[model samples]
Target chain A: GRALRVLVDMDGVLADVEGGLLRKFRARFPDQPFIALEDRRGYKACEQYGRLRPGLSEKARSIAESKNFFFELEPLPGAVEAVKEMASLQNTDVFICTSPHKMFKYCPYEKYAWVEKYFGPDFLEQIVLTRDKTVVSADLLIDDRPDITGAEPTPSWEHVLFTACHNQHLQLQPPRRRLHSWADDWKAILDSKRP
Target chain B: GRALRVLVDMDGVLADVEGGLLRKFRARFPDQPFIALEDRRGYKACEQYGRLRPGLSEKARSIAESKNFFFELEPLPGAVEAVKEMASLQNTDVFICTSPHKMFKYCPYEKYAWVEKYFGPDFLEQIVLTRDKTVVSADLLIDDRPDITGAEPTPSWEHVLFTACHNQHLQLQPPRRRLHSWADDWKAILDSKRP
Candidate 1:
């Protein structure tokens, strides 16, 4: 527990699962009285119905479980390899720490299973499924939504800006640590080895 | 193939989707001069570098497909199930027929695969992909964008009014086919089919 690590996002930062699923869902259920940013179940619906496409749900699920946690998904490419390499390192871990604003239509356990089924074993216990990641202290935070970075209570950690869709806020003023993928460049962290 | 069909599109319909992608592509690769859309492979870069989210990709893909042949993109909730049921009804087939605008980079494969995945397999073949679907003499013609539908290629086939993020010219008129997934209701089509 003393050895800390990283937290990840689920949507774009994990894979384009939300967008992919929404398109499928919209085409399938165009008249379900769904409203974007309003329905908390928007995500659950996507997970439940949208992942049917081959290489979609599996890809997203792997990314979720591979790391510590993923929620309010902003899945990015290369997340799996990045987390895999990072997880390979001693004293390093990846947790998808999500504290979404919406109420849960599905318990975090199923969400955890969604991640586990994709990422594999060992992600559990190691994973900290949270609605308030700001309280947690960590070495790194990989998130697509910059809102979390601004809200993070612990300012001591390095924040990784995973890419998200049309997120105009992230582009403004002060820039944060931005990387295309974690698996590719994380080794530099050990090299810098900043405590 | 006899089992397959085509939905085509025309004018700004195809051009609009291509235009949006082009704008994004140009924004992403402003320095690269007039690159062919098909040769493009930096979608990862688009996700990695652009403001557009992954969800927008599916939306834009739908628009691109809709440009030629008309289909209520905002398909009614029951549309998928209705199509599935129709497919199960022997030689009686339901296909997406539209006349796409002549424009590059407007690929309906997304819509094709989308319908197939959401509705069921063998759905793609049942889909007629073309830009000039209204003239093909098919089962249905659905679209939100106007230029194609307004053209009045022939009066033989059924028409369904679909909605897009924009284009409300058809709002007041009686919809030939109304779809909620794409928007409106296809109930008229079903009502007409009833014994």
Candidate 2:
């Protein structure tokens, strides 16, 4: 029987999506208010930036929805080594399951390039680009999204909240698993979850 | 009850990939031997062309692997209306599940644009871009690949061979369902497979 299939998120889990947005926001409009990377409290950066000032508009949306917005973001610390090992593990299937922005003109191309740049060409084949993660079958989905739902109310994968600034709102119980950092004791944590 | 999720392949199923390639191949190198729209007979077009002549090489690989190769392929006959209807069905969830070429520099971006062009923005979200379809959860997968295998040997979805010149070698039995064209009696054939 196929036992453990681990699905990893791309934006926050593998790439520094929030940090890139924060930098881009500050650089594009220096006078306008910008949220600090750590201080980001909202899941969607575009929405968060757009709501910063009620009187003004089109600032955040322009920056986010622009071409090459997701091109060259730095990989999150320890994401490469951690996920690379997860891919090569015996009897374990791992994929970088990512959801593109609704305004996905260049997102798919950039994500593919990003993965190839950071993880190499071999890892490129392991990417699963799907807006609905629920339709994908897996034992665990390590994602930054606090809640993931689609046509399927019940996804097979157990949602493992990957550490991010926005998802800090929902303080889970002791039983709930949340990965604080990839640099931490993730191997034991991930190994324990295998069936 | 949640049931009957259909996953459709992109390249040959929805797109006239072979025809586009043939035109490109003919236009690029008129003297070089080319695969006709109806005469193509391999799972991979690039491989098929490479094997055409032992003395010469790099002609087929160049045309197939180049940029914008998949940009403007004409949609297969009746693909738009058929898949659009499948999307709106009461209890059925349908997706454009596709695999990119291994050398996927421009394929992802072009494929996204193609789907948006034909099916519109709404259908863009339903796209499940994965190298391994076995990891996806679906009741039926209408793909041209005669054999679909990944890390998981037993996939959740039944392989309904989509009609193509390349996939004619399969020669499936009477009980097995194979869709010749979207214009044909696909509705009743697909409806009978529902639980």
Candidate 3:
């Protein structure tokens, strides 16, 4: 049986990056009106931060550059179990297709370290670190990004949005399903018919 | 015509790890009788190093630990052109399936940096960092390793050896062909008919 090759993102889907960032923001500037997670409609985090805190966009980059920020991140709810289930699927080749922050020097290393710690050593080998996730060859991509630029206009694989507060506002076309949670959504993906 | 899915090795096949390691060993241990690479018949580099310089097995680990062994590696002759050709081949999915040093913390980062520097960002996205090359599912594997353990017992695709000083000693059965050089051998593979 030739099953779909699944490519899952790390930040919002597995690790709670948005949640962690907001925590840092609140601690730094208690008086400022911190942007709510649901209001992060833009593609980049800086965009939302600029609207909330005009002078703090650059500060957010510094926060990202902070040592061990990524390593110290908490895993999203059921992410460990969901990822394990995804890997155990029959005839599927599951890979963590993640991007590294351009500004943060330690981003790549920390991301790799985090994956190794949480997912075990098996995933360390299967991980793909790249800025352009579209270049990878896979049957399905579960990501939280509203729009992945440079991706194939009409790709063979399906690109489902992993529900995140940041991207709940975007409207998608047919076949671009919204995956709210891995527990139920993953099963639906498996049970649903393929193109 | 659809091209074959090729998985090329990094160290021996593209970048000369043996050549680089031997050079480092010679400069560092001037008094010791350094064993020629052709005599390195073991699977792991540490195994060969133990035979070459007993009690200096720890030294071998240090050599691997040296700031940037993977990054400082020079590309093997014709490797650049050969990989570019493989990438350009119609419908070919060329992936760099290489291992990382488990003990060396910086090994994975250096390896990724090396790939991005030499093979460009395109290959970086396509690269798969792993200790067990056998875990990767590809149509053809062009590696210098004598035998990748846990690989398909009877694979549907070809598993050819990339010629190197380390693996020249082994005797392989039919279907396990030796690829001397990608410049000539690559053309031969493309021209040669398959069952």
Interface RMSD of 2: 1.2
Error of 3 at A192 (Å): 6.5
lDDT, residue A17, model 2 = 85
Model 3 error, position A5 (Å): 7.2
Docking class of 1: incorrect
- lDDT per residue for candidate 1 within B24-107, as digits (tens), equals 545554664432444333322233222344454544444334433222233334545655555555334444443213222223
The RMSD of every model to the true structure, in order and in angstroms, is 23.0, 2.0, 4.8
> Can you write out model 1's per-residue Cα lDDT over A138-186, one digit (the tens) per residue?
5676665555532224454566665444342345444455655554575
**Candidate ordering by DockQ (highest first):** 2, 3, 1
Residue A87 of candidate 1: its Cα lDDT? 70
- Candidate closest to the true structure, highest DockQ: 2
Top candidate on TM-score is 2
Model 3: per-residue Cα lDDT over A14-79, one tens digit each? 989988888887887777777778777765787667766677787776677787788888999899
lDDT agreement with native, every candidate: 0.44, 0.81, 0.72
Report the poorest 10 consecutive residues by lDDT, candidate 1 chain B.
B1-10
- TM-score for each prediction? 0.36, 0.93, 0.74
